[PDB]
Structures are given as structure tokens and as C-alpha cells.
């Protein structure tokens, strides 16, 4: 089971319920969150994630998060996990609008074991299918009210999209816009390799900006790799030398099969795993 | 505010109920329904329990045990009716449960009807059209998007309303990418034209409104033609009346659309009466 740490720094008893029945995180999915990886005694890219928490909170008209109190709760939760186990941990920051009719927002951090599915996805890779998201490429900017760039607690469709792919024998999904441009995964950001330069869809599309992807581009640029944001199509995916689904939890999952077509492997696949490994510890 | 779990416990409202890893708060993974408590009973209970079943099927949630839900609704209702003669906002919460645990989370909750609802029934709302971002063939050609389910993931619905609130608008009418009228973030859109009532078809990426369906049933019985049609923004303005229909805000007439003040029509008073009779057709 998991560990809970409120921003007061108090660690919760394992069995005690925390949230009220009228908390807007549960009644309306009204809140924002972030996911952190605990590896080798510390959480990875803490500050980069707290900046996205601020950007998500700003988009959601939530009180601006108090970073000194969040940092302390992360440090306390981290020290409890690494004390209990040497395994990697899944750290989550939950930031809700609070109870209904009550102004105090709900905030706590939570660490849980890393699911075994990610260890296989890192190890073996994934098979993915392309799905039409339904949004055009101008969705994130021309329609700001749709808050597509925010990591909200309203993940029902993302989970349903994965359930749909599971029934099709696929391990993940790549969303594509109505006009045919690659968007993102339901829980990951798409990164491409070509000829050496690494490409990902631009962030002004109706997609999130990935903390892992940004840290990946920064180290890759420092090591001599040209990185750039371009509009990608499904054909560009198949003509590539590699496809990855990058995320804070699943560091780098290579897409070995896309829509039933097996994609060939490239020597670049082993170095890519090193880059994300080096990326998530760039803050250290 | 009263909470009644399906386990049969009538709980204190301020006592915490949910765990920190409950998927309703961690991922919004669940379904819900909202019912109005009026004159000693909840309105259109069976129609609401049927959509709860339909929402759970789209969400791969366990098939709801309706006898247990009926008891939780009847118990929660009668405790409200005992405390007050006021109308109540009763909602049923049905989540996938905790992480790594197979038991789904289920409970009923009653709260007072907000004052916003009392004004909207009396005076109506001003609404703006907004691009939903989905095309009109979105609900069918993209079944994975579960657009037809009343899910706990309303972050966009609430964010869309805050956006309209900052512009001085009281509600929103979603419009598809190709320009078809969809629904409201919390309501079903109904139009009047010449004595004819129209609503968007349910195969669009929209919910099926329990109130609108009951409205069509009563309206047809009293001689009014009702039908499902594809509407465009022009159809709204050439209409004789626009309403946002929902279980709590029974019928909110749109008095201002995209800044254009819309005049009142004799059908407007009849429209309010029909919805009143519809929500008690099961009685
Ligand atoms: C969390 C998430 C990502 C990846 O974000 P990271 O900061 O890199 O972990 C990508 N897409 C979606 C939809 C997400 O929710
Ligand atoms: C709840 C809801 C409605 C109306 O549903 P009723 O069963 O009539 O109350 C309409 N549109 C949306 C988006 C809703 O969530």
C-alpha cells in the first residue's frame, strides 16, 4: 500500500480515510496533479514538476501552490519510502479545489509502489495503436477554455482509451489530430529519432509539455544531438528510426509495433535509454 | 448535506469517507447522476438509474445493484424530507474504487439546491457558444472517447463555465468543430420553433438528458411536436425559445445568446409548466 503526507508534514496512518465525500477531486475531478519517480534515494526533476504544477493550477483557477510547503512534503514522503524499501517509488502530488462550499483547497502527496507494467514497458517496449483524438492542431491555443495543456485529475477518457487499446491487443495509444498530426499518448509524450536529431510534436498543440521530454532534449543537446519540435504525421512515425513513449514513471518505452506493423529496431535504441536515464537525474 | 453509503451507513458529512488513493479523486475514474428531491420524492428515479447503468457499461464498471441503490436513494431522500420542505440536490457517486482493490466506491449524497438554480428557473441565463473541440460524428466514429457517459471527469465542464463567468455569461452552449449544436456543460439544449420542440440527436458526442426525454414524452402527449434534429447556431437565433434542461435546473431559458438579447415568446410560460409535469410523470 501507499504513504500519505499532507502539506503540514504529517504522515497519515495507513488505514485512515483522508478525503471528504464532497471533495471536488472526487465529485467533479476538479484538480491538478503531478507524478514523480523515486530512484536512488531522491525524487527526479522535483523543480521541473513543481513548475508544471503551478502552470496547471493557474489554468484551473486554483490557489497558487505554495512551493516551500510542497517541497517539504516531498522530502518527508521521500525519506519514508527510501527508509522502507530500495525499490523505485511512484510519487504523486494531488491538488484539488477542496470541499464544495469550502474555500480551503485539498493538497497532499502520495507515494506508492511502481507498477510492474512499467518495468516491462521499459524492458520490453510496447505495441501501440493510432487513434483520432478528435481535436484539431489549433486546439490548445485557439481553444484555451479546453485546458488541454493542464494535467488535471479528470483522467477518465485517458483510462478508457487505454482499456479500448487493451481489448485490441495494444499496450498504448498515439493520439492523432483530425487534420492528421501526431499529438501525444494518453499517459506519455511522443519522441522520434531521425537522421542525428530527435523530434517531438510542438507544445502549442492541444497536448501537455513533458517534464521528462524537456529534460531529455536538454541533455541530448548538451551531448551533441540536435533536438527540435516539428509537426509529425503517421507516415513520419513509420519512416522514423525509433518511437518512444516518454513519461516520468515509464521513463522510455519503445514502440516496437504500431497498428499491427512491426517496426524495426535501430542501434539508437540503447543510447536513447541512457539519455532519459541521464535526463531524469540532470537536476542532481 | 447528508451522505448515505450503499453499505447502509448514514454518515456524518464532515467525517472523511474516501481514501487518498480512491480513483474518483486520483483519476476521476467513475460515473455519477444528479437528482432533484421535490415533494417528498426524488424525480424520475428509474430513468436516472437506467443511465447510471448505461454509464457504467461504457466505463467497464460493475453492473449496478439497483435494489441497493434504490434503498440508498430512498433513505437519503427521506432524511432530507424530514429536515426540510426545501428542494434537494441528490447525487449518486459510483467510482472504480481504490487502486489495487476490486471493491467499487458507491454512495448517495444530498445537498441544498444552490441559489444559482433558483434564479435560473425564474429569470433564465445568458449563454455563449463555445467550440467543444469534437466533431459531430465524434461520438460514434470515436467510441473510445466515451462521450455518452456521465463521468466524474468534469474538469473541462467546470473550467468552461468559469471561462464564461469571467465574460459575464451564465452558461455555455457547446458547438462542434463542424458547427453543430451539441449540449451544455451541465444541461441539454432544447429549441422551440413554428409549436415544435427540437434537441440535438444523441449520437452526437453528448449525453442523453433524462429531463429532456421526459419533456418530449409529456409535450407529445399534450399535442406538441418534438423531434431530434441537427441544429446550427443560426437555428438557435431563428427559434422561438432556447432552454438548458437538466435534472436540477429544470428549465433555464436563454435570454441572451452571444450578446444578443432574445425576446420572450408566449411558449416560454408553457415550456416551464411542461417540464414541471414531466419530472413527475413517473408518479
Ligand atoms: C503525465 C502525462 C505525460 C508525461 O508527463 P511527464 O512529466 O513527462 O511525466 C504525457 N501525456 C499525458 C496525457 C500525461 O498525463
Ligand atoms: C447531467 C447532464 C445533462 C442533463 O442530464 P439530466 O439527466 O437531464 O439531468 C446534460 N448535459 C450534460 C453534459 C450533463 O452532465
Q: In terms of domains, do B194 and B124 share one?
A: yes
The protein residue with its alpha carbon nearest to ligand 2, atom 15, reads B186
Put simply, whether A132 touches B (Cβ < 8 Å) is yes
CB contact under 8 A, A156 and B30: yes
- C-alpha B72/C-alpha B81 separation (Å) is 14
Three-class secondary structure of residue B36 per DSSP: strand
Q: In terms of domains, do B276 and B218 share one?
A: yes
Q: In terms of domains, do B177 and B273 share one?
A: yes
DSSP state of B133: S
- C-alpha A192/C-alpha A210 separation (Å) is 14
Cβ A78 under 6 angstroms from ligand 1: no
Chain A residues in contact with B25 (beta carbon < 8 A): 19, 23, 25-26, 31, 94, 96, 153
Instruction: Please choose, from the candidates A225, A266, A2, A256, the residue with its C-alpha nearest in 3D space to the C-alpha of residue A123.
Output: A256
Q: Are B236 and B242 in contact (CB under 8 A)?
A: yes
Q: Are A43 and A74 in contact (CB under 8 A)?
A: yes
Instruction: Please choose, from the candidates B242, B282, B248, B283, the residue with its C-alpha nearest in 3D space to the C-alpha of residue B47.
Output: B282
Q: In terms of domains, do A85 and A123 share one?
A: no
The residues pairing with B4 across neighbouring beta strands, listed in sequence order, are: B10, B108
E strand or H helix that includes residue A130: strand A126-132
Backbone conformation region of residue B120, classed left if phi is above 0, alpha if psi is from -120 to 50, else beta? alpha
Q: Closest residue of B to A25, CA-based?
A: B25
Q: Which three cell numbers stand for residue A245?
A: 513513449
Question: How many A×B Cβ pairs under 8 Å?
Answer: 178
- C-alpha A279/C-alpha A281 separation (Å) is 5
Please state the separation of Cα A26 from the chain's center in Å.
21
Q: Are B128 and B173 in contact (CB under 8 A)?
A: yes
**Residue where one domain finishes, among candidates B67, B97, B113:** B113
Q: Which three cell numbers stand for residue B249?
A: 435546473
The protein residue with its alpha carbon nearest to ligand 1, atom 7, reads A211
Cβ B98 under 6 angstroms from ligand 2: no
Q: In terms of domains, do B129 and B230 share one?
A: yes
Question: What's the residue count for chain B?
Answer: 283
Cβ B209 under 6 angstroms from ligand 2: yes
A163 min Cα distance to partner chain B (Å) = 8
Instruction: Please choose, from the candidates B163, B130, B107, the residue with its C-alpha nearest in 3D space to the C-alpha of residue A150.
Output: B163
Handedness of CA B178, A143, A155, A131 (dihedral sign): positive
Resolution, in Å, please?
2.7
The alpha-helical segments, DSSP class H, found in chain B are 23-26, 45-58, 66-83, 115-123, 138-141, 155-166, 210-221, 233-237, 267-278
Ligand 1 atom with the shortest distance to the CA of A246? 8
Q: In terms of domains, do A162 and A212 share one?
A: yes
Q: In terms of domains, do B189 and B88 share one?
A: no
Number of domains in chain B: 2
- Say if residue A225 carries a ligand binding annotation: no
Q: Are A178 and A132 in contact (CB under 8 A)?
A: yes
Q: Crossing angle of helices B267-278/B210-221, nearest 10°?
A: 110
The protein residue with its alpha carbon nearest to ligand 1, atom 10, reads A188
Chain B residues in contact with A134 (beta carbon < 8 A): 133-135, 138, 142, 145, 177, 205
Instruction: Please choose, from the candidates B201, B147, B204, the residue with its C-alpha nearest in 3D space to the C-alpha of residue B176.
Output: B204
Q: Which three cell numbers stand for residue B220?
A: 407529445
Cβ B176 under 6 angstroms from ligand 2: no
Q: In terms of domains, do B108 and B188 share one?
A: no
Three-class secondary structure of residue A263 per DSSP: coil
Q: In terms of domains, do A74 and A204 share one?
A: no
Q: In terms of domains, do A242 and A121 share one?
A: yes
Q: Closest residue of A to B61, CA-based?
A: A160
Domain that residue A280 falls in: 115-284
Q: In terms of domains, do A191 and A104 share one?
A: no
Q: Crossing angle of helices A67-84/A46-59, nearest 10°?
A: 130
Q: In terms of domains, do B147 and B17 share one?
A: no
Q: Which three cell numbers stand for residue A215?
A: 529534460
Q: Which residues 6+ apart lie within 8 Å of A274 measured at CB?
A: none
**Residue where one domain finishes, among candidates A61, A79, A114:** A114
Amino acid at each position: 500500500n501507499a504513504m500519505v503526507v499532507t502539506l503540514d508534514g504529517e504522515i497519515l496512518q495507513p488505514g485512515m480515510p483522508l478525503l471528504h465525500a464532497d471533495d471536488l477531486a472526487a465529485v467533479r475531478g476538479d484538480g491538478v496533479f503531478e507524478t514523480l519517480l523515486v530512484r536512488d534515494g531522491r525524487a527526479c526533476l522535483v523543480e521541473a514538476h513543481l513548475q508544471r504544477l503551478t502552470q496547471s493550477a493557474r489554468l484551473m483557477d486554483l490557489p497558487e501552490p505554495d512551493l516551500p510547503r510542497w517541497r517539504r512534503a516531498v522530502e518527508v514522503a521521500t525519506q519514508r519510502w527510501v527508509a522502507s524499501t530500495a525499490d523505485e517509488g511512484a510519487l504523486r502530488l494531488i491538488y484539488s479545489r477542496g470541499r464544495e462550499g469550502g474555500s480551503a483547497p485539498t493538497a497532499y502527496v502520495m507515494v506508492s509502489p511502481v507498477p510492474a507494467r512499467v518495468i516491462g514497458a521499459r524492458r520490453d517496449g510496447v505495441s501501440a495503436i493510432t487513434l483520432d483524438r478528435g481535436l484539431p492542431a489549433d486546439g490548445g491555443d485557439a481553444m484555451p477554455w479546453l485546458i488541454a495543456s493542464a494535467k488535471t485529475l479528470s483522467y477518465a477518457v485517458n483510462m478508457a482509451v487505454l482499456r479500448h487499446a487493451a481489448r485490441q491487443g495494444a499496450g498504448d495509444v498515439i493520439f492523432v489530430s483530425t487534420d492528421g498530426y501526431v499529438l501525444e499518448g494518453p499517459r506519455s509524450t511522443v519522441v522520434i529519432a531521425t537522421d542525428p536529431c530527435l523530434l517531438t510534436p510542438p507544445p502549442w498543440y492541444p497536448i501537455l509539455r513533458g517534464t521528462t521530454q524537456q529534460a531529455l532534449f536538454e541533455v541530448a543537446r548538451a551531448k551533441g544531438y540536435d533536438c527540435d519540435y516539428r509537426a509529425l504525421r503517421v507516415a513520419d512515425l513509420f519512416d522514423s528510426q525509433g518511437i518512444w513513449l516518454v513519461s516520468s514513471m515509464t521513463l522510455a518505452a519503445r514502440v516496437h509495433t504500431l497498428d499491427g506493423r512491426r517496426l524495426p529496431r535501430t542501434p539508437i535504441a540503447e543510447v536513447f535509454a541512457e539519455l532519459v536515464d541521464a535526463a531524469i537525474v540532470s537536476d542532481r
